[PDB]
Design an enzyme around this catalytic site. Structure first.
Site, short mmCIF file in Angstrom:
data_model
loop_
_atom_site.label_atom_id
_atom_site.label_comp_id
_atom_site.label_asym_id
_atom_site.label_seq_id
_atom_site.Cartn_x
_atom_site.Cartn_y
_atom_site.Cartn_z
CG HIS A 44 12.64 2.46 -66.02
ND1 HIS A 44 13.31 2.19 -67.19
CD2 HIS A 44 11.81 3.49 -66.28
CE1 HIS A 44 12.90 3.03 -68.13
NE2 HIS A 44 11.99 3.82 -67.61
CB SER A 67 11.28 4.69 -70.61
OG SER A 67 10.23 3.88 -71.10
CG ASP A 111 15.88 -0.24 -66.64
OD1 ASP A 111 16.70 0.70 -66.74
OD2 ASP A 111 14.68 -0.12 -66.96
#
Length: 290
Positions: free
Chosen positions: A268, A102, A241
């Site tokens: 994710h 991320s 995601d």
């Protein structure tokens, strides 16, 4: 167990956890996301020690167990120098692998742009080179959400009523949809989520929640600079995601020779949804670029 310490890195105390492998074929540094989370949710990566891969975990400035620096240092540029100082302190001049998740992926990309000579390879999971792009894509995810939750997010989100129960419920649904899917949330994930709400970095740099980026990183974008990265690069992203495959695609096209993998049925936190497959893919990548 691994070794845990609290060292002074670039003026502030940073907590790190170094899980050494019996045979150190390689060193892998990791960067948690958020901004403002903690290393906890990445602990499933410890499995790679069995493959001769030493894994370094650490809580970035103002995150988790680490101390908070002046807000003037709440920047990705500061995060980069912090990472390099930690790498040198623990590994000296040895080249290592760097993985980011991320926001951690954006941080890893920024790191590689300036310090790729210290890297044998780069791994970006659910990463992004552009916050605006990430926001555009998440907005589409909100729209594809079932009316009930979509409507709550659009309404209360427009008035900034993040305390509303229906909104909170919508946020939770989104997370169970694009953060960690069809899985019982493990304690390690709950811990990072808790650290996010407890410290100040998430609120300031990111914003209310994952899909509401009102923080200081809202306009961040280094897409025009990542082409400079010329080391082996592995890019992973989940089908569902929250940081969409389209966002990952942009990174892939800019980095020559990079490899892109979209994990079907995953979101994710692919390292928890397909722990074995994920660790196997990363360890294969690492063992091929020693």
């Amino acid at each position: 167990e691994c070794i845990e310490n609290y060292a002074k890195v670039n003026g502030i105390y940073i907590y790190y956890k170094l899980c050494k492998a019996p045979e150190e074929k390689a060193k892998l540094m990791t960067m948690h996301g958020g901004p403002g989370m903690s290393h906890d949710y990445l602990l499933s990566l410890r499995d790679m020690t069995k493959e001769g891969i030493t894994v370094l975990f650490y809580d970035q400035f103002g995150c988790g167990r680490s101390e908070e620096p002046d807000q003037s240092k709440f920047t990705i540029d500061y995060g980069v120098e912090e990472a390099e100082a930690l790498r040198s302190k623990l590994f000296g001049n040895e080249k290592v692998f760097l993985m980011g998740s991320s926001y951690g992926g954006a941080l890893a990309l920024a790191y590689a742009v300036k310090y790729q000579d210290h890297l044998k390879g780069l791994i970006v999971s659910g990463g992004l080179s552009s916050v605006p792009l990430t926001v555009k894509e998440m907005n589409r995810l909100i729209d594809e959400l079932p009316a009930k939750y979509r409507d709550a997010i659009k309404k209360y989100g427009s008035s900034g009523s993040y305390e509303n129960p229906e909104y909170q419920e919508a946020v939770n649904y989104f997370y169970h949809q694009h953060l960690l899917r069809s899985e019982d949330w493990p304690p390690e994930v709950l811990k990072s989520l808790e650290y996010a709400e407890r410290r100040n970095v998430y609120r300031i740099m990111n914003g209310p929640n994952e899909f509401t980026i009102t923080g200081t990183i809202k306009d961040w974008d280094i897409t025009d600079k990542i082409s400079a990265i010329k080391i082996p690069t592995l890019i992973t992203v989940g089908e569902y995601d929250e940081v969409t495959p389209n966002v990952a695609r942009v990174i892939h096209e800019k980095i020559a020779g990079s490899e892109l993998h979209v994990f079907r049925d995953c979101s994710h936190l692919t390292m928890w949804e397909d722990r074995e497959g994920y660790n196997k893919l990363l360890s294969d990548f690492i063992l091929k670029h020693l």
